[PDB]
Structures are given as C-alpha cells and as structure tokens.
Structure 1
Amino acid sequence: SHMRVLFTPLPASSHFFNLVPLAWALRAAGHEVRVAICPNMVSMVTGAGLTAVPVGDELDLISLDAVEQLHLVDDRSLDDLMGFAEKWQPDLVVWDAMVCSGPVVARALGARHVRMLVALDVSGWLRSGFLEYQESKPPEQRVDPLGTWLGAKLAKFGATFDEEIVTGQATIDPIPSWMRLPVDLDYISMRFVPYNGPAVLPEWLRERPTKPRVCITRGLTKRRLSQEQAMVERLLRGAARLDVEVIATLSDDEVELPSNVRVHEYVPLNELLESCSVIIHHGSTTTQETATVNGVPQLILPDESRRAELLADRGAGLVLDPATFTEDDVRGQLARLLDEPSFAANAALIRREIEESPSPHDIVPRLEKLVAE
C-alpha cells in the first residue's frame, strides 16, 4: 500500500453509498481503506466490498446527549474509534459532513482529514454566517458554542480545536458545482458515481421498453420510517393516467392498481434509470443524483426543496407541493416532462457537465498530494 485511509460515515445507506466509489477508487489505487461503522451496519459496508471496522454500540439512527450519538462523538463510540485509530495510524480520514467522529480522531492523531458532503453544505454556510458575525463583535464577545464543545471532546485526547474540525482541511463535493451554496472553502469537485446497494439485473430490465417508462421511488434511508401516505397512492394513480409503464417501489402495503403499474420492493435503481424517460421522487440526494447522472427528467415532491428548485431552474425537472398536489397535477407535469423535448435536452446538458468533472479515480492523486504535503 501507500496510504492508510479511514472513512467515518454516518450509519445511513444514503450517506454510506455516497462514499463507496471514492473508497473503491482509493483501494484500486493500492491504498488500504477501512470503514468505521456501528456494529449493526457492518454488513452494509461489507455488502459494498469494503472492509468494516465495528465501532461503538449498536445504533438505530433511523429511530433517533442524543446529539452526541448522532454525530458519533459519544464516549463509547469515539473512545472505541480512537482505540483503533491509534493502532492503525491512518494517514487520511475521509468523514461524512454530519459526524465529528472523524475529524476529532484525525486531529488527535495528526492525520490529514477531508470532509465529504452528501447534500448542499448547509453546515458550512451556517458556520460561514457565524464566523462573519463573530469577526465584527468585540474579542471578549466572540463566543463559539460549537468551538468550545468540540474543544472539550478534543481535550479528552490532548488536542486543540481548529476551524478545520468543523469544515475539514478540504471538502469533497459530489453535488454539481453550479448548485454549490456560496461559501469560502477548499472544495474538491467530484462526479457523482451511483452506488445503490446490491444490484441484480433481472431479465426484464435487459430489453428496451416498448412504452415510455416512468420510475417512481424514494431513497432507501427515506423509506425506513416512513396515514399519510395517500400521497404515494396519488402519485401512482396520477402517473398511471398516461400511456406509460410505471415502475414503483413500495413496501408490502397498498392499494388495486392500474394495469400499467408495476410494483417491486427493490430495484437496481441506476440500471433501471438507464431505461426510464422520467423519474418521480421525494428529493433524496442519491435518487436525485442517480437520475441526474443518467440525464433523466425529474418530478420532485420535496435541502431537498432547494436542490429540486435548482434543478427546475435549469429546466430538467419540475416540482410539486407534497402537501397540496392532486392526481391531475401529477398527470400534467408528467406529460410536460415526457412531451416537451427541452426537459430531456437540459437534463442531457447537466449530464454532460457532470461527465466532465473529475471522477473519484481523478480525485485520488489530489488526496495523495494532500497527504504528502
């Protein structure tokens, strides 16, 4: 190997999946890559071909000082992580923007660390306001609740607070440039490469569809909880009203369905989207990014609002209000998305833009440079 690399994701499909191609990029380059995950998510990490380091107590993040657990910075988990990081001595920590696990350990060890976004850098942008506010107050007044909080976690291991602990020494950004919230940081642009969990191509997904194909879905994390409810029934019936094949992802639950609807518990999303003409979703980053990367016009029922808006602004999608929309709304917008050639044309442009930003493969030498400096 050359580097030892430790990822600290948030234990949630959507977050984890977003890091997988970068982690495989590093591994493909001969780096050793390990993923720290709570012990009950281990088989999600292992299901992506990555090596898991179980750390801390079981954590059902979906059901959830409880603030500490969600940021992975509770004694049990942090001490456990740090026990492993001390023996393994990684050179680089790539940490998911919503945990403080990774940067705390990194700074404690003197490792380099990089933040990865899954969504718009809301954190970064809030923190930007805060620092701007702070700068103009008198020195004696420059309080920093986050700073001093992280300072205490850091002291437990004999290290000090730094701004980097909040926003990383760099931030890898998989959302397209032109959506980026305006904040002054070292962003590394990275092409989104879809990973959606275990993917088997069933025979039927081998053929060109014979009728326009519409995918209706919501992010894997968003589906685990998850009256009322009737919104999906409305989307489904709304979309059925056109001469299209409708593929929908649902739990065991219902219902009697239009003859042109097909319901599955799971599909391989990226591979389905290659054959779809429209996707309808609730604005999870990964379903959105997977559609965008396949250049597939979107109907979004909402940072999801903002990402949905931004995408409509470039005419690649349309939005509907999750709390006021009617079957007929669904019908009409779907029709626009299918009939007006511009929508697909714009989506094709955004796709080409993305296809031209550096891949995970191209980010590896930048990370290597960062560790070697």
Structure 2
Amino acid sequence: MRVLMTVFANRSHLYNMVPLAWALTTAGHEVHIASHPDNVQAISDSGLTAVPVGNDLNIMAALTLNETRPEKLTWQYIHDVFAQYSQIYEYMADSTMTADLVAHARQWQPDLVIWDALTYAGPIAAEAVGAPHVRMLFGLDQWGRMRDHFNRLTGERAADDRHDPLADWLATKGEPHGVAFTESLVTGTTTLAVAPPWMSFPSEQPALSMRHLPFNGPAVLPDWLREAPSRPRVCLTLGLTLRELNVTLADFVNAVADIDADVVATFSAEQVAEIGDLPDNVRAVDFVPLHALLPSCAAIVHHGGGGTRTNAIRYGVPQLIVPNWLWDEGYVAERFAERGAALVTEVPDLTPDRLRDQLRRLIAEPSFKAAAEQIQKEYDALPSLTETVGELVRVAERGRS
C-alpha cells in the first residue's frame, strides 16, 4: 500500500517517525515522507524518500498546552489555547504546504496518511481522497486531553454558546480542497501513541500503542566507546538547561562529577569554554549515540524529553530528570519518580549539591535500577513495530469499501 507520512520541518519530530517509516518500508509498502524543503536533508540522512511540500519553514530563526491544574482548565481557557495554537499550527503547515500536500495525495492517491500530531496538513490531504489517517504522537497527548475536556464542556453550554476555534480553523483550512470539518480532522481516524500506556493520559478515544523505537539520527561509534567499560558510567545531557542558571556552570559540573563513576557529558564548544578545566572523570563530547552509550550507564541526567527518556526506558537506565516544559516533561518526570525509576529536580530547585546527591543515590541504591528494569520489561512487551504495521494495514483496509 502507499503511505503518505507528513511532518513539519523539525528533525526531532522527523526522527520520532523514522523507525515506523522504515518498518512500513521493509514490510513492502511504498512510503513517502512529505515535509518542507528544509527538512529534506534530514529525511535523506534517515534513509527515506522525501517529498518536499510548501516553502522552507525555518522554525528555528499565559496559554499553554501542558496546563493540568483543574481550576485553570475552564471552557474559556481551552478555547483560547485553541485559538492561539490554531494560528501557530497554521504557520507550521501552510496553505502552500497544505495545497502541495493535497495535490500529491490526489496524484499519488495514498492508502494511509500518517501525520505528526502537530502537522495539520496531514488530515486535510487524507480527506481529499477518503484515506483513513493516523495521528502520530511524539509524547503525551496534551492536545487530545484538552480536546476531550473542551468537547465535554461544550456539550453542556447553551447552543448559541459553543464557539469552537478548531472547527473554524480546520473548516477554513479544508475549504479550498472541498474538505468539510469533522472531528476526525482534529484527532485522526485514529491515534498512534509513542509513550507507554502506564504513563499516558486517559483518552475518550482509543490509541494504538507501540514499543517505540527512539531513532537517534546518524551515528559513528567513537573509539573510546569501543573499549571495555572501565567502571560505572553516567550520561549527562543537561547542557541546554545548565547555561540558563554566581552559581557557575563549572560549579554544576564539579558537583555532578563528584560521584563514583565516569561521566560522559554533552557540551557546546561555547560551554566547554565557559566551564574551563574539566574534572578528571568527565569526558566532554559534542554528541553521543545513546543506544551505544546507555547499555553501559548506571544513570542518565537529562531534561525529560521523549527521545532521551525512551532510550532510558529501552535500556533500563535510572534517570535524573531536570524537566523542561516544552511539552510533557514535568508530568512524565513525576510518573517515573512514582515508580521509583527516577529522581526529579525542578528547574527552580536546581543546586549543584542537589543534583550530585540525587545522582549519588541512583548510583548507590539498587532500587532505582530494579524499577528502571521493570519499566524496560513492560516496554519490551509492547507491540513490536511489525505488529504495528499489521494494525496500520488493518486501519487502511477497515478504512475501505
């Protein structure tokens, strides 16, 4: 079958769907990855077929989606979140991008559209051709969680009092292509999850789950990784968060290194300068392939994003999470902490001493390792990518007459 996969130009959201693209490819299907022209090189570097759509995105040059306090989750708040993000997401998948993707769907006529959850050209293109479409998550389903609340609230207001910014947005987006607003434009014929069911939000809709494979991008094994591990290793990838905060970057690095293990730390040229002389047991590296590193690590310290935490899940590695707030990191961090698999320090509570002490516990108390391994066992038992391709074929077949 022909699968049209679409993702806005962002390498992380691309890598999120690379293993699924390739599972579909090696089972025999023809897979096109459609994205803005600036994502073409990344699609190439992943071994896949790029179909450029729209103009370069260049996405790099009050109302949040991670809000979970019940009192803040009013109809008016979620309404306004929807109004704002409807604009942002439009920007991220253009009328040009959307027209190019519809034109390709009409020409190629795919049997399944799989769209990155932030890429709303996906469902417009799919519906121009009655292909069933799968909304692919890239962490927890914040948008579906808010959408469920919103639709529950809406169905109990007066009828004249149910403005829906998503309906106005997506009816508008679909209009030039004869695509009518349905609710399935918002959340997909169905949704594919990348996070394990035990940490996901309850949904009023079903979600396929999957033993998510964390694609780390092109990789060359360095010599130093090739050598028999000397003694316990810890992986430190908190570079970005650390520059943010009289208490110095060197101070943070000296404390974090003061533990019974070798540290592999990812740092800029900028940061390696800013921190000056490194401790003895620290190797600074601008990038490391986690799947080559993590099998030998007693801990990983990181900002709680999906790619890195899926690697700690897959390799059974305890975590020290300093959550960022780009998507779901705070909420997932607490889920791991509750299972005994992680220790958390919020950004506002960050001291060198606090990180070191947490790291020392992860290293010393084997309960964290056991909990991380238990997590790994339950992940290994999720449906394989081959099983998932089998579900996706049932979606495209069940989606046909």
Q: Shared fold by TM > 0.5?
A: yes
CA deviation profile, 1:42-85 (whole Å, cap 9, x unmatched)? 1111111110011111121123x96255441x222111212222
Other-structure match for 1:94: 114
Partners in 1 of 2:355 and 2:15 — Cα distance?
Answer: 30
Q: Contact (CA 8 Å) 1:213, 1:244: kept in 2 or not?
A: yes
Of 140, 143, 152, 1:132 maps to 152
CA deviation profile, 1:285-337 (whole Å, cap 9, x unmatched)? 11111111110000010010001111011010000122232111111100110
Other-structure match for 2:244: 228
Partners in 1 of 2:345 and 2:242 — Cα distance?
Answer: 19
Paired residue secondary structure (2:13): helix
2:195 is equivalent to residue 197 of structure 1: no
Structure 1's 298 and 82: CA in aligned 2 closer, same or farther, altered over 3 A?
same
2:139 is equivalent to residue 141 of structure 1: no
Residue 228 (structure 1) shift:
2.5
Residue 209 (structure 1) shift:
1.5
Residue 204 (structure 1) shift:
2.1
2:321 is equivalent to residue 296 of structure 1: no
Other-structure match for 1:263: 284
Which structure 2 residues correspond to residues 87-126 of structure 1 after superposition, within 5 A? 87-126=107-146
Partners in 1 of 2:257 and 2:138 — Cα distance?
Answer: 32
Structure 1's 192 and 236: CA in aligned 2 closer, same or farther, altered over 3 A?
farther
2:171 is equivalent to residue 151 of structure 1: yes
CA deviation profile, 1:116-154 (whole Å, cap 9, x unmatched)? 111110000100011001111233322211112101111
Equivalent pairs, count? 365
Other-structure match for 2:373: 348
Partners in 2 of 1:118 and 1:20 — Cα distance?
Answer: 12
Other-structure match for 1:208: 228
Other-structure match for 1:316: 341
Residue 203 (structure 1) shift:
2.6
Structure 1's 26 and 95: CA in aligned 2 closer, same or farther, altered over 3 A?
same
Partners in 2 of 1:366 and 1:236 — Cα distance?
Answer: 46
Give the percent of matched residue pairs that are identical in Structure 1 and Structure 2: 44
Q: Contact (CA 8 Å) 2:8, 2:36: kept in 1 or not?
A: no
Other-structure match for 1:32: 30
Of 361, 364, 378, 1:336 maps to 361
Partners in 2 of 1:26 and 1:244 — Cα distance?
Answer: 41
Q: Contact (CA 8 Å) 1:301, 1:322: kept in 2 or not?
A: yes
2:258 is equivalent to residue 241 of structure 1: yes
Structure 1's 8 and 231: CA in aligned 2 closer, same or farther, altered over 3 A?
farther
Q: Return the TM-score normalized by structure 2.
A: 0.87
Q: Return the TM-score normalized by structure 1.
A: 0.94
Corresponding letter in the other structure for 2:160: E
Partners in 1 of 2:378 and 2:135 — Cα distance?
Answer: 23
Structure 1's 69 and 154: CA in aligned 2 closer, same or farther, altered over 3 A?
closer
Paired residue secondary structure (2:220): coil
Structure 1's 123 and 68: CA in aligned 2 closer, same or farther, altered over 3 A?
closer
Other-structure match for 1:10: 8
Residue 13 (structure 1) shift:
2.1
2:306 is equivalent to residue 285 of structure 1: yes
Of 173, 178, 195, 1:175 maps to 195
Other-structure match for 1:43: 41
Paired residue secondary structure (1:7): strand
Partners in 2 of 1:191 and 1:5 — Cα distance?
Answer: 20
Paired residue secondary structure (1:204): helix
Partners in 2 of 1:275 and 1:228 — Cα distance?
Answer: 29
Structure 1's 98 and 51: CA in aligned 2 closer, same or farther, altered over 3 A?
same
Structure 1's 231 and 22: CA in aligned 2 closer, same or farther, altered over 3 A?
farther
Q: Contact (CA 8 Å) 1:213, 1:247: kept in 2 or not?
A: yes
